[PDB]
């Protein structure tokens, strides 16, 4: 039904109204004919000691198709330890396609705690955790010079602790 | 010659809940935040920049519904609007 699927299109009219309104305040887009956009999805569903994240395959399907719709070539990696996630992020940062890209998306989906994202072998006795800080460090201008000046969007589906996130008030 | 660049710039992160708090998932419909993000990107990528889309996603969570959660934007160093220009 088209490359963009269910993503509503920006008409060329709508693109020119945006483009000269905030002209010098918009990230530049590369020619569609030659650019090589990449995105990375890391999803942990089956764990050695933590309950299985049923429904994760729906998330992978939806986010993979969405990112392809927006023009990204999507790598999907599943069921990684935190060390494996680091190795894969370093490999993603080194990809030559980033030099002829204008942006990137990274999506992480797992169990989580306050400190960060759980790897497949995480346990209370032996934690296996990737911190958001490490993700930023691996993709910054020093460690990923190919993405200098380009937007890097990081999406994280995970708990950030055990609390319900609510308080009561009197109506 | 060499020139100096900011070591950290042009990032945005979007998390499914606020610090200390849980995020919800359904076995058949998937993770609530991911589905909500997909719906909003499909509807609004054509007209809104990424920071504005994420704000609309937060707004859609504003009313707790038994499984309250509030997605949070973190560590933002975008210096420009990021428009995705779908179709171009």
């Amino acid at each position: 039904s088209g490359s963009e699927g269910n993503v509503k299109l920006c008409s060329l009219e709508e693109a020119q109204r945006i483009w000269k309104q905030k002209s010098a305040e918009i990230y530049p887009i590369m020619d569609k004919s030659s650019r090589t956009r990449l995105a990375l999805i890391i999803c942990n569903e089956e764990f050695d000691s933590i309950p299985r994240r049923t429904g994760a395959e729906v998330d992978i399907t939806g986010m993979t198709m969405l990112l392809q719709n927006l023009g990204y070539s999507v790598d999907v990696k599943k069921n990684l330890t935190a060390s494996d996630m680091t190795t894969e992020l370093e490999a993603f940062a080194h990809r030559p396609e980033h030099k002829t890209s204008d942006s990137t998306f990274l999506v992480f989906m797992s169990h989580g705690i306050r400190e960060g994202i759980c790897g497949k072998k995480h346990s209370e006795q032996v934690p296996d955790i990737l911190q958001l800080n490490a993700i930023f460090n691996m993709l910054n201008t020093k460690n990923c010079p190919s993405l200098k000046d380009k937007p890097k969007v990081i999406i994280i589906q995970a708990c950030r602790g055990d609390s319900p996130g609510v308080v009561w008030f009197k109506d | 010659a060499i020139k100096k660049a900011h070591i950290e710039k042009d990032f945005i992160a979007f998390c499914s809940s606020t610090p200390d708090n849980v995020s919800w998932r359904h076995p058949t419909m998937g993770s609530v935040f991911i589905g909500r993000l997909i719906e909003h990107m499909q509807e609004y990528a054509c007209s809104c920049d990424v920071e504005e889309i994420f704000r609309k996603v937060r707004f859609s969570f504003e009313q707790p519904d038994g499984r309250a959660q509030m997605p949070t934007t973190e560590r933002v160093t975008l210096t420009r609007c990021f428009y995705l220009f779908p179709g171009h």
């Binding site: 309950p51 049923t54 169990h111 989580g112 589906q157 708990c159 | 849980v22 995020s23 919800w24 998932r25």
Partner: peptide, 4 residues
């Protein structure tokens, strides 16, 4: 529904 379950939590992550």
């Amino acid at each position: 529904f379950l939590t992550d």
